[PDB]
RNA sequence: GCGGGGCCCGAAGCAUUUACUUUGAAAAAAUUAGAGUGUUCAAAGCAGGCCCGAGCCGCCUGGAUACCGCAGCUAGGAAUA
RNA sequence: UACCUGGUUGAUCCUGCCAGUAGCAUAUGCUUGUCUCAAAGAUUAAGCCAUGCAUGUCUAAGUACGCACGGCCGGUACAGUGAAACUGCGAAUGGCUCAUUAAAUCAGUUAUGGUUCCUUUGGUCGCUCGCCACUUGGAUAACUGUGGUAAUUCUAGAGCUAAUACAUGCCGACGGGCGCUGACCCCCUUCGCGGGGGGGAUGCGUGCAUUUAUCAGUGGUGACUCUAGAUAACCUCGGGCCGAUCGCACGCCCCCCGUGGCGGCGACGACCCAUUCGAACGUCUGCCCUAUCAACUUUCGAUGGUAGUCGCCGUGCCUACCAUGGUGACCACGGGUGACGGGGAAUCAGGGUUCGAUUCCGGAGAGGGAGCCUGAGAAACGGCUACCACAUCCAAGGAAG
């Protein structure tokens, strides 16, 4: 109204947080940060709904104010910090080292990683430009910007950066044939190879994505996130491997494992 | 509380539209700066963002540009000679953006003499002893006499333009927005554009 | 109602006061308020007036121009203690600090010293 | 037949008119460099937007206006009002209660750039959109295509 | 697009224009429609389930899916008007 | 459940309504043993309101020269704990109500290539050639001590004292490079000559940001007057950045030399760039009843055109000078609404009918209109000024709503 809002109601929160309805009126309201907030996930509900190390909004605070929660190799001390996608959280005392990945039902999935794969993350670039005195810049998926990148990295290309150094390790170019992940829209969480990128002059470009089991689909270019060279992903995948099962296909594999 | 929004206009058909909220803060009051020639008074008004804009209450000099030989010097403002938007703003001598100004020639006379070594503004001579006889002669060397005698292609000025170097004052045009940035910059009239306005001053 | 410097009219008028004129300490920032203040010309319609000596002449009024109050809080920033004791240069500012004596009855008789600044 | 019919010197904001006039640059054969640009989405720039002599802030080819947004189409219905025409775009509106349509319309004022000659009453004109140019004129004319002409006695 | 040849097809013109139809995006939850689950039952709620032989650093699993008009944006169709 | 039943007549077949019947939602009537969820001053009065309350806030880390306390660990800067006050930051959220508002809001959609954005993150923060820097200047609160008022979070005078408050201002990097200039090159064609070069003596300017002009055409987009490069110059005194700040563990070189040089992790601020949270203005299509409302809008902006003025930016948003336009029976314009819009709700064969003040999203407004201050963000009302309306205290001088 008269300025920016800093509350959030519980039913207006994104449903892939999977919040309750009757435990309160309000929602966690993730702070301003690297990721946009409908897309993202805050640190509060991660350790009391998704990991159950805490029970209140007070208990998530007094683990975090003991200064060992390492988002992307940095200790972030506010409990409504927006986490986001392809980031490594690090407990560093009991050492789980999660990476935040969408599962095949559209939700952030609890997913461990080995403590030497935890050293890096991947980021789609959204803009490359020349900065002052004729030097290059790029800006990434998160708010990290990079000076002097490898000049083969075009727009909406995927880079790999390591934490604790911060310069780009590997770039992996958006080309047909590569193995992408969709992070937005009705198809998100599914993992498949890129078929083609069909252009639109001025409008939105859509791509078609063939999965590894014939079910091709399509989302527009702004949702596509390449994480593989040809067919092998550079990161560990969650269970299901980004294959959306139908509801009869979800029925029988779930009601036969409970044999 | 003078506003700038669109809901007080009669709409495209010709119907009265009724006000649907109060007038807001982001249609902030718009008083005129009315920058005029004198000493230097600059006042600063904050805007949204906490930013500043320098409105110019009274101005003395400018930073006008020459272009054809690419010279820019500060120069003081003598007179306002013609305005396109309103013939009443020149009887009150007020600086606006597209007004034709009148400035002096003593930054442009001495740069052109210190670069080409031709007398300039002269019609009669026999007074040129103190700093004019020396600058074109200067006891040059060989190759410095070489590089200036080859500028006898690009020392010419069109006859409509040195006609106003003789009798003192050059008329130029403001390109800056005084009262918005607080400066009076711009460029000098020349060419087919100068034939335009010197008709529109003579026809007054 | 207190007087105000610069009215140049005897009587009582009403001024719109911002932060930093006189006679008005605001409650929140940016607040302006209209308040009645008395003019700077003095009249017979004053209940009290303040009155400060700039020159002592003949003799001692008892209880008024004698009995010096000790200025108990000395200089604290390390440029008004260097100016007070006429210290030339690097004269060990920590040494010539003034110290307040403390004389409660039920406690041991203390001394306190300040911090330093700059 | 001149261009300077205003009370201010009409010119293009980018090109510089003066080019070292002298015994090299004689006043007999004198052109000036014409700034034009090209609009995307495959729309041609007509000859009169290059070899013309006009001046317009609001021409999409030689002014400071940049088309991006919708592209529509209409019929030129009134060709008064210097440098801005009014076009009417008919359409059909559907009432699902009666399962039948409703022949509606709404007209719209668009900027006729003077790089078009044969714009007469009753043509087809495709129109793109851009920044606000006047109180009601939000669009700009891209491509005329004639109708009811080509031969007249 | 495997200055002049071959298993070769992209840019380009859409060479009347539309309506119509089909496809694909993108569409906030709650609610409704429904999947799951002895809240003891039910209306509801989104939880819960499983053996302790103690190693049980506790294990497994859910928190679906369908519906978002018309208007736009894509591709395909050309009878009908 | 795609459903009917009683009534005009002496009877009859009809048309047609009436009545019946079933929901659900306000109220009311009699009645009411137990337990799970649970609306609740919306309609009429967006009427009036006593009283009490709902926005405030210390870290190891801005300022303790209150004995309020401390072991006052000892002959001196401060063992800390700290009230109060200065500074900073919130108080622009939430809550409430539905009065206004009929292409307006709002909804889908699509833009900002026409702008701003505290923060959050991530960047940038020795690029500038120029007799305190081992630290510069002046005040002020809390405090002390006098007060004035019937009466308020009213405040006065004088004495003290601080800063991350309010201002000033430098060292180092700094050795120079470049460009514009410029007293010797004679080795070239001195043959009378014209010469072809590199070079110094010389004085200016030099980074980012702001402002204007011109030149060229690294990286971009469907598309620039984009980004980056180049040259001439600007830099507003109510003056752009280029750290005179505070914690913690303390270590290293010590050759000048036992006093001077080097260092780890922070916490703060800092122009600009992107990000995030946004906001604003635009495009498309969509809204109820009325012709006992058929022409409207333009002196007084109605539609456009040039030039501007301010505005954060586009634009009649204003102003001047010209053009005579724009909308309309495909319902303009005027009127009404018991009109906040929507997600929705009741209904239930299909098509529909009707409700939606009400927890979700958005908008509007705090008695009525209006004007501003601070601030990144308010034309704010548990902010201020004024009128109107209503109303409180007075010791009748004023005070506060």
Residue D124's H or E segment, with its range, is: strand D124-129
B50 φ, ψ to 5°? 75, 10
Please return the burial class of A10, using the count of CB atoms within 10 Å of its CB with bins 0-12, 13-18 and 19+. middle
D96 Rama sector, left if φ>0, alpha if ψ -120 to 50, beta otherwise: alpha
Structure tokens at B174: 């403001």
Q: How far apart are CA A178 and CA A174, in angstroms?
A: 7
Give chain B positions within 8 Å (CB) of D21: 156, 158, 191
C71 DSSP assignment: -
Distance D89 CA to F70 C1' (A): 87
Contact B98/D at CB under 8 A: yes
Contact B191/D at CB under 8 A: yes
Which residues does A113 contact at the CB level (< 8 Å), separation at least 6?
Answer: A88, A97, A98, A99, A235, A236
Instruction: Calculate how close chain D gets to B84, using CA atoms only, in Å.
Output: 5
Q: How far apart are CA A207 and CA A199, in angstroms?
A: 8
CA A231 to the chain's CA centroid: 20
Measured at the CA of D57, the angle between CA D51 and CA D58, to 5 degrees, comes to 90
Q: Does the nearest atom of strand E lie within 7 Å of A187's Cβ?
A: yes
| Contact by Cβ (8 Å): B100, B164 | no
D47 DSSP assignment: G
C117 DSSP assignment: B
Which residues does A103 contact at the CB level (< 8 Å), separation at least 6?
Answer: A109, A189, A238, A239, A240
Rg over CA atoms, chain B = 23
Structure tokens at D109: 């004022």
| Resolution of the experimental structure, in angstroms | 3.5
Q: Does the nearest atom of strand E lie within 7 Å of D8's Cβ?
A: no
Which nucleotide lies closest to D60 by the C1' atom and the CA atom?
F223
CA distances from B57 to B34, B96, B142 (A): 7, 12, 53
D24 DSSP assignment: T
Q: How many CB atoms neighbour CB A44 within 10 A?
A: 22
For residues A137, A140, A142, A144, the Cα torsion angle rounded to the nearest 10 degrees is -20
Which nucleotide lies closest to A22 by the C1' atom and the CA atom?
E45
Tell me whether residues D22 and B196 touch, CB distance under 8 A: no
Which nucleotide lies closest to A220 by the C1' atom and the CA atom?
E25
Q: Which nucleotides of E are covered by protein (CB under 7 A)?
A: 12-14, 17-20, 24-31, 35, 45-47, 60-65, 69-75
Distance C46 CA to F148 C1' (A): 9
Question: Up-side HSE of residue A68: CA atoms within 13 Å toward CB?
Answer: 8
| Contact by Cβ (8 Å): A104, A243 | yes
C77 DSSP assignment: B
For residues C57, C59, C65, C67, the Cα torsion angle rounded to the nearest 10 degrees is 140
Measured at the CA of C60, the angle between CA C57 and CA C62, to 5 degrees, comes to 145
B8 DSSP assignment: T
- A168-172 β-sheet, strand order: A120-124, A158-162, A168-172
Residue B112: name the closest of B130, B136, B128, B145 by CA: B136
Do chain D and chain A touch with ≥3 beta carbon pairs under 8 Å?
Answer: yes
Which residues does B151 contact at the CB level (< 8 Å), separation at least 6?
Answer: B116
Give chain D positions within 8 Å (CB) of A199: none
Contact A214/D at CB under 8 A: no
Which residues does A125 contact at the CB level (< 8 Å), separation at least 6?
Answer: A138, A139, A140, A141, A153, A155, A156, A157, A158, A159
For residues A192, A198, A203, A209, the Cα torsion angle rounded to the nearest 10 degrees is -10
Contact A202/D at CB under 8 A: yes
DSSP chain A: --S-----BSTTS-GGG---SSS-SB---PPSSSS-TTT--BSTTTTTTSS-S--STTTTHHHHTTT--EETTEE---TT-B--SS-B---SSS---BB-EE-TTSSEE--B--TTTTTEEEEE--EEEE-GGG-EEEE-SSS-EEES--TT--TT-EEEEETTT-SEEEEE---TTSEEEE-SSTTTT-EEEEEEEE--SSS--EEEEEETTS--EEEEGGGEEEEEETTEESS---TTTT-PPPHHHHHHHHHHTT-
Report how many Cβ contacts below 8 Å link chain A to chain D. 6
B50 DSSP assignment: G
CA distances from A239 to A36, A45, A236, A244 (A): 26, 22, 10, 11
Residue B158: name the closest of A104, A217, C90, D21 by CA: D21
CB-nearest to D18 from B68, B84, B197 is B68
Measured at the CA of D74, the angle between CA D68 and CA D76, to 5 degrees, comes to 115
Please return the burial class of A227, using the count of CB atoms within 10 Å of its CB with bins 0-12, 13-18 and 19+. buried
Nearest CA in chain D to A201: D41
Which nucleotide lies closest to A81 by the C1' atom and the CA atom?
F120
CA B109 to the chain's CA centroid: 17
| Contact by Cβ (8 Å): A168, A150 | yes
Q: How far apart are CA B141 and CA B147, in angstroms?
A: 11
| Contact by Cβ (8 Å): A204, A220 | yes
Tell me whether residues D16 and B67 touch, CB distance under 8 A: yes
| Contact by Cβ (8 Å): B36, B93 | yes
| Contact by Cβ (8 Å): B165, B119 | no
| Contact by Cβ (8 Å): B94, B101 | no
Q: How far apart are CA D10 and CA D53, in angstroms?
A: 11
Residue the block writes with tokens 């907030």: A37
Which nucleotide lies closest to A12 by the C1' atom and the CA atom?
E29
Structure tokens at A144: 């990290």
CB-nearest to D20 from B98, B154, B200 is B154
Tell me whether residues D17 and B9 touch, CB distance under 8 A: no
Burial A198-220, CB ≥16 within 10 A → b, else e: eeeeeeeebbebebeeeeebebb
Q: Name which of D41, D69, D129 to mutate to probe chain A: the one with the most chain A Cβ atoms within 10 A of its Cβ.
A: D41
Q: How far apart are CA A173 and CA A226, in angstroms?
A: 8
Which residues on neighbouring strands pair with residue A101, listed in sequence order?
A109
Residue B185: name the closest of B72, B31, B85 by CA: B72
Residue B57: name the closest of B35, B30, B76 by CA: B35
Residue B147's H or E segment, with its range, is: helix B142-149
Q: How far apart are CA A217 and CA A244, in angstroms?
A: 11
Which residues on neighbouring strands pair with residue D88, listed in sequence order?
D75, D107
Structure tokens at A51: 């990991």
Tell me whether residues A202 and D41 touch, CB distance under 8 A: yes
Give chain D positions within 8 Å (CB) of B68: 18, 20
For residue D80, the enclosing domain spans 1-153
Please return the burial class of D151, using the count of CB atoms within 10 Å of its CB with bins 0-12, 13-18 and 19+. exposed
| Contact by Cβ (8 Å): B37, B80 | yes
Contact B17/D at CB under 8 A: no
Q: How far apart are CA A188 and CA A242, in angstroms?
A: 9
Q: How far apart are CA B1 and CA B22, in angstroms?
A: 11
D25 DSSP assignment: B
Q: How far apart are CA A103 and CA A107, in angstroms?
A: 6
Q: How many CB atoms neighbour CB A172 within 10 A?
A: 19
CA distances from A168 to A114, A128, A152, B21 (A): 21, 14, 12, 52
Number of domains in chain D: 1
């Amino acid at each position: 109204a008269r300025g920016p809002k800093k509350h959030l109601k519980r039913v207006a929160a994104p449903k892939h947080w999977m919040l309750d309805k009757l435990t309160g009126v309000f929602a966690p309201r993730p702070s301003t940060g690297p990721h946009k907030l409908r897309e993202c996930l805050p640190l509060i509900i991660f350790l009391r709904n998704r990991l159950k190390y805490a029970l209140t909004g007070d208990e998530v605070k007094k683990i975090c104010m003991q200064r060992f929660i390492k988002i992307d190799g940095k200790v972030r001390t506010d409990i409504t910090y927006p986490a986001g996608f392809m980031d490594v959280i690090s407990i560093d005392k009991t050492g789980e080292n999660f990476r935040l990945i969408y599962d095949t039902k559209g939700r952030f999935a609890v997913h461990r990683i080995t403590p030497e794969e935890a050293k890096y993350k991947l980021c789609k670039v959204r803009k490359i430009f020349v900065g002052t005195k004729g030097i290059p810049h790029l800006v990434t998926h998160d708010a990290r910007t990079i000076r002097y990148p490898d000049p083969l990295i075009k727009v909406n290309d995927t880079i790999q950066i390591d934490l604790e150094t911060g310069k780009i390790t590997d770039f992996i170019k958006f080309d047909t044939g590569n193995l992408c992940m969709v992070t937005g829209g009705a198809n998100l969480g599914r993992i498949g190879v890129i078929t083609n990128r069909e252009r639109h002059p001025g409008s939105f470009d859509v791509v078609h994505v063939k999965d590894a089991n014939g079910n091709s689909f399509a989302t527009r270019l702004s949702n596509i996130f390449v994480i593989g060279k040809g067919n092998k992903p550079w990161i560990s995948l969650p269970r299901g491997k980004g294959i959306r099962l139908t509801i009869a296909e979800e029925r029988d594999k779930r009601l036969a494992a409970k044999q | 509380g003078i506003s700038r929004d669109n809901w007080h206009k009669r709409r495209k058909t010709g119907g009265k539209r009724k006000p649907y909220h109060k007038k807001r803060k982001y249609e902030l009051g718009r008083p005129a700066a009315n920058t005029k020639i004198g000493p230097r008074r600059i006042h600063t008004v904050r805007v949204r963002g906490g930013n500043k804009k320098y409105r110019a209450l009274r101005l003395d000099v400018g930073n006008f540009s020459w272009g054809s030989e690419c010279c820019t010097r500060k120069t003081r403002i003598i007179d306002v000679v013609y305005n396109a938007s309103n013939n009443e703003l020149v009887r009150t001598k007020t600086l606006v953006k597209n007004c034709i100004v009148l400035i002096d020639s003593t930054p442009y006379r001495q740069w052109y003499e210190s670069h080409y070594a031709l007398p300039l503004g002269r019609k009669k001579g026999a007074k040129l002893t103190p700093e004019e006889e020396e600058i074109l002669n200067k006891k040059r060397s060989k190759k410095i006499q070489k590089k200036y005698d080859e500028r006898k292609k690009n020392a010419k000025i069109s006859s409509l333009l040195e006609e106003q170097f003789q009798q003192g004052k050059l008329l130029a045009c403001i390109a800056s927005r005084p009262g918005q940035c607080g400066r009076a910059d711009g460029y000098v009239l020349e060419g087919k554009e100068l034939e335009f306005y010197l008709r529109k001053i003579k026809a007054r | 109602f207190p007087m105000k410097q610069g009215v140049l009219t005897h009587g009582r008028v009403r001024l719109l006061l911002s932060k930093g004129h006189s006679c008005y300490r605001p409650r929140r920032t940016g607040e302006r308020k209209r308040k009645s203040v008395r003019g700077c010309i003095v009249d017979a319609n004053l209940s009290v007036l303040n009155l400060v000596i700039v020159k002592k002449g003949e003799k001692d009024i008892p209880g008024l121009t004698d009995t010096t109050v000790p200025r108990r809080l000395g200089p604290k920033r390390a440029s008004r203690i260097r100016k007070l004791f006429n210290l030339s240069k690097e004269d060990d500012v920590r040494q010539y600090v003034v110290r307040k004596p403390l004389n409660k009855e039920g406690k041991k008789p203390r001394t306190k010293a300040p911090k330093i600044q700059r | 037949a001149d261009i300077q019919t205003e009370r201010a010197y009409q010119k293009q904001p980018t090109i510089f008119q003066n080019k070292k006039r002298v015994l090299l640059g004689e006043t007999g054969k004198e052109k000036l460099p014409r700034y034009y640009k090209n609009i995307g989405l495959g729309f041609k720039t007509p000859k009169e937007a290059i070899e013309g002599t006009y001046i317009d802030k609001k021409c999409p080819f030689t002014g400071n206006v940049s088309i991006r947004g919708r592209i529509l189409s209409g019929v030129v219905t009134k060709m008064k009002m210097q440098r801005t025409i009014v076009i009417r775009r008919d359409y059909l509106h559907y009432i699902r209660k009666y399962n039948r349509f409703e022949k509606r319309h709404k007209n719209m004022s668009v900027h006729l750039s003077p790089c078009f000659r044969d714009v007469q009453i009753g043509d087809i004109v495709t129109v793109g959109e851009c920044r606000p140019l006047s109180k009601t004129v939000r669009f700009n004319v891209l491509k005329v295509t004639k109708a009811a002409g080509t031969k007249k006695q």
